[PDB]
Enzyme design. Sequence first.
Site, PDB file in Angstrom:
ATOM      1  N   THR A 154     -56.528  30.498   4.354  1.00  0.00           N
ATOM      2  CA  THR A 154     -55.319  30.345   3.565  1.00  0.00           C
ATOM      3  C   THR A 154     -55.412  30.917   2.158  1.00  0.00           C
ATOM      4  O   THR A 154     -54.573  31.715   1.767  1.00  0.00           O
ATOM      5  CB  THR A 154     -55.005  28.860   3.417  1.00  0.00           C
ATOM      6  OG1 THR A 154     -55.012  28.237   4.697  1.00  0.00           O
ATOM      7  CG2 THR A 154     -53.718  28.627   2.723  1.00  0.00           C
ATOM      8  N   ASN A 175     -61.890  29.725   1.216  1.00  0.00           N
ATOM      9  CA  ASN A 175     -61.477  28.366   0.902  1.00  0.00           C
ATOM     10  C   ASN A 175     -62.584  27.620   0.153  1.00  0.00           C
ATOM     11  O   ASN A 175     -62.285  26.793  -0.703  1.00  0.00           O
ATOM     12  CB  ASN A 175     -61.071  27.608   2.163  1.00  0.00           C
ATOM     13  CG  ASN A 175     -59.748  28.060   2.739  1.00  0.00           C
ATOM     14  OD1 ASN A 175     -59.030  28.845   2.147  1.00  0.00           O
ATOM     15  ND2 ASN A 175     -59.369  27.556   3.900  1.00  0.00           N
ATOM     16  N   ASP A 256     -49.809  25.349  10.667  1.00  0.00           N
ATOM     17  CA  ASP A 256     -51.254  25.385  10.646  1.00  0.00           C
ATOM     18  C   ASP A 256     -51.828  24.042  11.081  1.00  0.00           C
ATOM     19  O   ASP A 256     -52.643  23.981  11.997  1.00  0.00           O
ATOM     20  CB  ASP A 256     -51.736  25.763   9.266  1.00  0.00           C
ATOM     21  CG  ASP A 256     -53.233  25.756   9.122  1.00  0.00           C
ATOM     22  OD1 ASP A 256     -53.893  26.658   9.685  1.00  0.00           O
ATOM     23  OD2 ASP A 256     -53.748  24.836   8.484  1.00  0.00           O
ATOM     24  N   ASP A 303     -49.825  33.476   6.658  1.00  0.00           N
ATOM     25  CA  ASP A 303     -51.050  33.849   5.975  1.00  0.00           C
ATOM     26  C   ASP A 303     -52.135  34.220   6.972  1.00  0.00           C
ATOM     27  O   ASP A 303     -53.026  34.984   6.621  1.00  0.00           O
ATOM     28  CB  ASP A 303     -51.536  32.750   5.034  1.00  0.00           C
ATOM     29  CG  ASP A 303     -51.812  31.430   5.686  1.00  0.00           C
ATOM     30  OD1 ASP A 303     -51.302  31.199   6.817  1.00  0.00           O
ATOM     31  OD2 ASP A 303     -52.554  30.634   5.098  1.00  0.00           O
ATOM     32  N   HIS A 304     -52.042  33.655   8.181  1.00  0.00           N
ATOM     33  CA  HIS A 304     -52.946  33.955   9.276  1.00  0.00           C
ATOM     34  C   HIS A 304     -52.465  33.324  10.581  1.00  0.00           C
ATOM     35  O   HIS A 304     -51.434  32.647  10.599  1.00  0.00           O
ATOM     36  CB  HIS A 304     -54.361  33.463   8.981  1.00  0.00           C
ATOM     37  CG  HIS A 304     -54.449  32.025   8.581  1.00  0.00           C
ATOM     38  ND1 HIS A 304     -53.989  31.020   9.385  1.00  0.00           N
ATOM     39  CD2 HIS A 304     -54.961  31.485   7.464  1.00  0.00           C
ATOM     40  CE1 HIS A 304     -54.216  29.898   8.724  1.00  0.00           C
ATOM     41  NE2 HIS A 304     -54.806  30.140   7.566  1.00  0.00           N
ATOM     42  N   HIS A 405     -59.150  29.078  12.524  1.00  0.00           N
ATOM     43  CA  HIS A 405     -58.923  30.444  12.104  1.00  0.00           C
ATOM     44  C   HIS A 405     -59.980  30.741  11.048  1.00  0.00           C
ATOM     45  O   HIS A 405     -60.686  29.826  10.617  1.00  0.00           O
ATOM     46  CB  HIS A 405     -57.515  30.603  11.519  1.00  0.00           C
ATOM     47  CG  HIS A 405     -57.220  29.607  10.439  1.00  0.00           C
ATOM     48  ND1 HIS A 405     -57.468  29.888   9.117  1.00  0.00           N
ATOM     49  CD2 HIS A 405     -56.774  28.333  10.539  1.00  0.00           C
ATOM     50  CE1 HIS A 405     -57.157  28.794   8.449  1.00  0.00           C
ATOM     51  NE2 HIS A 405     -56.707  27.841   9.274  1.00  0.00           N
ATOM     52  N   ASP A 668     -69.300  56.984  -4.107  1.00  0.00           N
ATOM     53  CA  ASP A 668     -70.368  56.957  -5.093  1.00  0.00           C
ATOM     54  C   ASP A 668     -70.382  58.211  -5.959  1.00  0.00           C
ATOM     55  O   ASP A 668     -70.030  59.287  -5.498  1.00  0.00           O
ATOM     56  CB  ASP A 668     -71.756  56.838  -4.434  1.00  0.00           C
ATOM     57  CG  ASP A 668     -72.137  55.457  -3.968  1.00  0.00           C
ATOM     58  OD1 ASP A 668     -71.327  54.505  -4.180  1.00  0.00           O
ATOM     59  OD2 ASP A 668     -73.233  55.320  -3.369  1.00  0.00           O
TER      60      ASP A 668
HETATM   61  C1  LIG Z   1     -52.695  30.035  -2.943  1.00  0.00           C
HETATM   62  N1  LIG Z   1     -51.717  28.941  -2.943  1.00  0.00           N
HETATM   63  C2  LIG Z   1     -50.413  29.218  -2.799  1.00  0.00           C
HETATM   64  N2  LIG Z   1     -49.988  30.441  -2.690  1.00  0.00           N
HETATM   65  C3  LIG Z   1     -48.608  30.463  -2.546  1.00  0.00           C
HETATM   66  C4  LIG Z   1     -47.948  31.756  -2.325  1.00  0.00           C
HETATM   67  C5  LIG Z   1     -48.590  32.964  -2.602  1.00  0.00           C
HETATM   68  C6  LIG Z   1     -47.974  34.180  -2.328  1.00  0.00           C
HETATM   69  C7  LIG Z   1     -46.743  34.160  -1.729  1.00  0.00           C
HETATM   70  F1  LIG Z   1     -46.120  35.341  -1.463  1.00  0.00           F
HETATM   71  C8  LIG Z   1     -46.098  33.004  -1.396  1.00  0.00           C
HETATM   72  C9  LIG Z   1     -46.720  31.797  -1.675  1.00  0.00           C
HETATM   73  C10 LIG Z   1     -48.015  29.243  -2.632  1.00  0.00           C
HETATM   74  S1  LIG Z   1     -49.191  27.995  -2.728  1.00  0.00           S
HETATM   75  C11 LIG Z   1     -52.151  27.629  -3.166  1.00  0.00           C
HETATM   76  C12 LIG Z   1     -52.179  26.539  -2.314  1.00  0.00           C
HETATM   77  C13 LIG Z   1     -51.835  26.393  -0.864  1.00  0.00           C
HETATM   78  C14 LIG Z   1     -52.440  25.136  -0.233  1.00  0.00           C
HETATM   79  N3  LIG Z   1     -53.099  25.384   1.047  1.00  0.00           N
HETATM   80  C15 LIG Z   1     -54.073  24.596   1.505  1.00  0.00           C
HETATM   81  O1  LIG Z   1     -54.581  23.732   0.791  1.00  0.00           O
HETATM   82  C16 LIG Z   1     -54.496  24.768   2.940  1.00  0.00           C
HETATM   83  C17 LIG Z   1     -53.531  24.858   3.948  1.00  0.00           C
HETATM   84  C18 LIG Z   1     -53.879  25.020   5.272  1.00  0.00           C
HETATM   85  C19 LIG Z   1     -55.222  25.117   5.587  1.00  0.00           C
HETATM   86  N4  LIG Z   1     -55.920  25.292   6.779  1.00  0.00           N
HETATM   87  C20 LIG Z   1     -57.246  25.291   6.540  1.00  0.00           C
HETATM   88  O2  LIG Z   1     -58.171  25.430   7.308  1.00  0.00           O
HETATM   89  O3  LIG Z   1     -57.429  25.137   5.184  1.00  0.00           O
HETATM   90  C21 LIG Z   1     -56.175  25.027   4.597  1.00  0.00           C
HETATM   91  C22 LIG Z   1     -55.840  24.864   3.286  1.00  0.00           C
HETATM   92  N5  LIG Z   1     -52.687  25.454  -3.013  1.00  0.00           N
HETATM   93  C23 LIG Z   1     -52.922  25.894  -4.273  1.00  0.00           C
HETATM   94  C24 LIG Z   1     -53.411  25.235  -5.418  1.00  0.00           C
HETATM   95  C25 LIG Z   1     -53.539  25.980  -6.582  1.00  0.00           C
HETATM   96  C26 LIG Z   1     -53.180  27.336  -6.614  1.00  0.00           C
HETATM   97  C27 LIG Z   1     -53.357  28.128  -7.872  1.00  0.00           C
HETATM   98  C28 LIG Z   1     -53.016  29.603  -7.699  1.00  0.00           C
HETATM   99  C29 LIG Z   1     -53.318  30.376  -8.964  1.00  0.00           C
HETATM  100  N6  LIG Z   1     -52.579  29.797 -10.087  1.00  0.00           N
HETATM  101  S2  LIG Z   1     -52.407  30.735 -11.418  1.00  0.00           S
HETATM  102  C30 LIG Z   1     -53.880  30.575 -12.346  1.00  0.00           C
HETATM  103  O4  LIG Z   1     -52.296  32.096 -10.992  1.00  0.00           O
HETATM  104  O5  LIG Z   1     -51.323  30.189 -12.168  1.00  0.00           O
HETATM  105  C31 LIG Z   1     -52.921  28.392 -10.311  1.00  0.00           C
HETATM  106  C32 LIG Z   1     -52.603  27.578  -9.074  1.00  0.00           C
HETATM  107  N7  LIG Z   1     -52.719  27.987  -5.539  1.00  0.00           N
HETATM  108  N8  LIG Z   1     -52.614  27.204  -4.400  1.00  0.00           N
HETATM  109 CA   LIG Z   2     -69.503  53.180  -4.107  1.00  0.00          CA
HETATM  110 ZN   LIG Z   3     -53.603  28.996   6.118  1.00  0.00          ZN
HETATM  111 ZN   LIG Z   4     -55.913  26.026   8.848  1.00  0.00          ZN
END
Ligand SMILES: CN(c1nc(-c2ccc(F)cc2)cs1)c1c(CCNC(=O)c2ccc3[nH]c(=O)oc3c2)nc2ccc(C3CCN(S(C)(=O)=O)CC3)nn12
Ligand SMILES: [Ca+2]
Ligand SMILES: [Zn+2]
Ligand SMILES: [Zn+2]
Length: 780
Positions: A154, A175, A256, A303-304, A405, A668
């Site tokens: 993710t 992750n 997911d 995302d996947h 995944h 390179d």
């Molecule tokens: C990375 N992320 C998110 N990205 C988007 C987004 C990005 C691009 C697009 F075109 C649309 C949407 C929205 S939320 C994110 C998440 C998502 C949470 N998941 C899980 O925890 C998860 C889900 C399913 C899973 N399956 C598995 O095996 O593991 C899993 C995990 N949660 C967060 C929390 C914080 C952030 C940060 C991003 C960067 N900013 S910044 C510094 O650029 O302002 C800070 C917040 N980010 N995030």
């Molecule tokens: Ca190189």
């Molecule tokens: Zn995911």
């Molecule tokens: Zn997952």
Amino acid sequence: GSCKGRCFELQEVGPPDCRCDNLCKSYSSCCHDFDELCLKTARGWECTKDRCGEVRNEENACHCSEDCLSRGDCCTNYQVVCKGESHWVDDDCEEIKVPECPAGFVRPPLIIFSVDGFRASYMKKGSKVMPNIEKLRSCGTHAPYMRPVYPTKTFPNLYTLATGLYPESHGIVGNSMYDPVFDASFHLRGREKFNHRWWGGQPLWITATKQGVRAGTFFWSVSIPHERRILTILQWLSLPDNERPSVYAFYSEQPDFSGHKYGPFGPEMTNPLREIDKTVGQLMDGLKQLRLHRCVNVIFVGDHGMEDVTCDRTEFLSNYLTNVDDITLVPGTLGRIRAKSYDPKTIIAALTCKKPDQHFKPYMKQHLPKRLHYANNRRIEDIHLLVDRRWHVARKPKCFFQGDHGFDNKVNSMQTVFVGYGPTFKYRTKVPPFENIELYNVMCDLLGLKPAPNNGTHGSLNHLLRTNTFRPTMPDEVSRPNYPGIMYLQSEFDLGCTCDELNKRLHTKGSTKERHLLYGRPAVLYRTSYDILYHTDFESGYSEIFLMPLWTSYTISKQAEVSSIPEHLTNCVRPDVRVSPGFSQNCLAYKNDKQMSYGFLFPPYLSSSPEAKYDAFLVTNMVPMYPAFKRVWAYFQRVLVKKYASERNGVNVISGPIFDYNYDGLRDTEDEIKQYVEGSSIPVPTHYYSIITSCLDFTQPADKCDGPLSVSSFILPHRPDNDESCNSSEDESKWVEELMKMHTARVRDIEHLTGLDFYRKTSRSYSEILTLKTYLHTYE
Ligand SMILES: CN(c1nc(-c2ccc(F)cc2)cs1)c1c(CCNC(=O)c2ccc3[nH]c(=O)oc3c2)nc2ccc(C3CCN(S(C)(=O)=O)CC3)nn12
Ligand SMILES: [Ca+2]
Ligand SMILES: [Zn+2]
Ligand SMILES: [Zn+2]
Ligand SMILES: *[C@@H]1O[C@H](CO)[C@@H](O[C@@H]2O[C@H](CO)[C@@H](O[C@@H]3O[C@H](CO[C@H]4O[C@H](CO)[C@@H](O)[C@H](O)[C@@H]4O)[C@@H](O)[C@H](O)[C@@H]3O)[C@H](O)[C@H]2NC(C)=O)[C@H](O)[C@H]1NC(C)=O
């Protein structure tokens, strides 16, 4: 100290002030009344005939009052129930040629509807399970699938979506991560991931802000229900122009989560998916009420994917490593290995081809397939395990889980979805599969933003859009070739090469290009000096710096004949009379090098006559190859080029060396080359590439194609052994082609790695050629 009038405010505040934004919960920082005023549920998320024209009761989750539109806090079906309007999904697709927006809108907004773990194949479920998603797909622009990045997790993938960068370049390499500079770890669970220090590149929301385009917060506390997330976006769109964002993201943890419990096979995946579709319909109904449904560009994207993975299919490193408490392991659908506070060479060896049913493969990260672009980051451990689809690797010893995944991103099960719907997207258009790194530029295009440097090829997705502001232009060629004549005598050459009067017009400065450079000379986009060499059967761009071809181009027809190398030309290496001894290789280097040998880029097996075959033994056609690698290369040259020519009605092959000793995926410099042939100035390639081009219309030969091109490419690791291939002690017909398939590559990958630009002279639009260059042949 209250959220009254502040729920999901685009401001952030405090301390001592308390917050009311999308992430206040994740910091446990909300005001006392957040859950009360912001996370309301009373009376659900749908109007009922009963509620039509109610006086506003602020305790309801969403409203059915006459004022509700002004605030954008209607239940999404308000106009359907209370104004006799139709659900969006029940309306016919109508083309949207121009953005149709309310007064004061200066640009069409973009809503990114991201769905976690939404496998491509789920789309087949149909308008029975998912009518709204099916309408978007059918009326709008869609791909059969979208390729994620590796690892197919993710956080790497969502951030790639946001930045257009590979995990290695944006920094979110998993992750879970350990950064040795921070001496800290990133975890899905925790507050650490909120620290900005981990997040590189420039995500869309930042790109937009810097260019004066306001963004909605992309992140949503898990506690916020999906209906509320949609309602918030709709309220935000209802804001006055000077407060209203132009870009928004919705995010769903589904399908997911269910995929983990059930797996992608589960007939019980339908309910999760039907929920998602409901959420989409709510969004579209919501937009339709606000007169925004023919204004906003909507992107539905995953995302996947998800694979069938049970806990009984788990490899334990403890069954291979006798020293398993000396190492840390990022486990699961991949492995990343590190010393606890240890010898990577014996670790790899101990993990290599030990068991028949071994469901993972160890790699030093630089030896991983280059298509994965998964090496150039201190957060990526040196030792990596590619785990077979459907399996897991753990450190030491029913299930709760049945799906997972994270696998190699060319695996079918890992593929995800893309749908573009709105005025800027095309109407009822199917486009070829593409990689998620390409989306950032599109999203920038959709918002009128100049994208930050990223790994997308800007232009390669112009075919998704009704209107594109960006017009791609071929790069200018930096170095010009020499076209040297015969300007040296044989006797002048003292190379140390054994090989057993003729009228000399031999190095045919003619016919060759026409039959061996089908798509124009590769442009060299770095400053160097090279010579164009012509021959009956091939053409090459010989480097005087690296003392070998940068590229070798030749066409093999369907009926081309394969010959062997005779006994008397086995060790034949001949001097070229177009290039000085100084800018030539020599045989003494190789006879002194105990480990290194040599091969030929143009194959002597495919010479067009006994006479022409002598040109294939030129010193200018020679490149350093380990014996082990010659097994691969020779099999490719003698057997597989012919097979491809036979299958595809002729092929054009462009083969050459690649030097990437710092594994940054980039050509390179001379300085970066860390290995030469013994006692010589002749550098050792880290890889050998080939680009195999032919006519998409296979009824036309490759040299007489009038239309779209078909390409397949590889970047083979130039290795001193074949340990990577567990069946390598058998005949090459049992393992070489599979090695090559693993190391499939985009032309664009080869371009990064060589500083060449291919396909400069064609009858195709340059944007189509960009699409061709981004293509990856997956064999899945
Ligand atoms: C990375 N992320 C998110 N990205 C988007 C987004 C990005 C691009 C697009 F075109 C649309 C949407 C929205 S939320 C994110 C998440 C998502 C949470 N998941 C899980 O925890 C998860 C889900 C399913 C899973 N399956 C598995 O095996 O593991 C899993 C995990 N949660 C967060 C929390 C914080 C952030 C940060 C991003 C960067 N900013 S910044 C510094 O650029 O302002 C800070 C917040 N980010 N995030
Ligand atoms: Ca190189
Ligand atoms: Zn995911
Ligand atoms: Zn997952
Ligand atoms: C994928 O796209 C990436 C972004 O375009 C490519 O990475 C870039 O690679 C170049 C060449 O190696 C680097 O250029 C150098 O930049 C430094 C410092 O400037 C930048 O520093 C940070 C680094 O994180 C960057 O984020 C800022 O935007 C700065 O502009 C200069 O001093 C050097 O002279 C040189 O120009 C870039 O730093 C780097 N950027 C990023 C974000 O990684 C990457 O090569 C592409 N991958 C492939 C395989 O093509």
